[PDB]
């Protein structure tokens, strides 16, 4: 379980788009991370606009 220490791998092209893959993860943890990580990404990230 521990040695199964996941592999954070990435495909990043330019500054506009990125694919981030992380496996393997225990039963139903993908959602446990992905869902609240997205909730952060979409609201509480710091920026500027008109």
């Amino acid at each position: 379980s521990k040695l199964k220490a996941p592999v954070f791998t990435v495909r990043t092209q330019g500054r506009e788009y990125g694919e981030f893959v992380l496996e393997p993860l225990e039963r139903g943890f993908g959602v446990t991370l992905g869902n609240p990580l997205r909730r952060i990404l979409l609201s509480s990230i710091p920026g500027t606009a008109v």
Partner: protein, 125 residues
């Protein structure tokens, strides 16, 4: 003639039966009951099928439900605090069998989560 409860187990040093009034089983006269149960520490749900545990060859492995969490409810209520109204006041509620306490478990959980965020450490290929 007895109603065997869980308290009727022999005491063991660093163990606490949480469940003393648990109705193990019901003896009448000249009823004889004698057994050795094996408790283990472990994680999640593990049938007897999977783990197949026997100390002796008249044992019967039993299904393990380890998680000492009975139910978990978050609650998300508007708190107008000071300036803005749309703030969340989160109070989550935890139910435990007593083996661990709610608090203990909540902290173990946060730790599991943080540690899981640590897996976004070094990228690759």
């Amino acid at each position: 003639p007895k109603e065997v409860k869980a308290r009727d187990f022999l005491p063991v040093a660093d163990v606490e039966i949480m469940n003393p009034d648990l109705h193990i089983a019901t003896l009448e006269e000249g009823g004889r009951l004698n057994m050795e149960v094996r408790v283990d520490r472990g994680v999640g749900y593990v049938p007897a099928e999977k783990h197949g545990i026997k100390d002796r060859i008249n044992a019967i492995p039993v299904d393990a439900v380890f998680s000492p969490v009975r139910r978990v409810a978050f609650q998300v209520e508007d708190t107008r605090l000071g300036q803005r109204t749309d703030l969340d006041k989160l109070t989550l509620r935890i139910w435990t069998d007593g083996s661990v306490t709610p608090l203990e478990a909540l902290n173990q959980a946060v730790e599991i989560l943080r540690e899981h965020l640590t897996y976004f450490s070094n990228p690759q290929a």
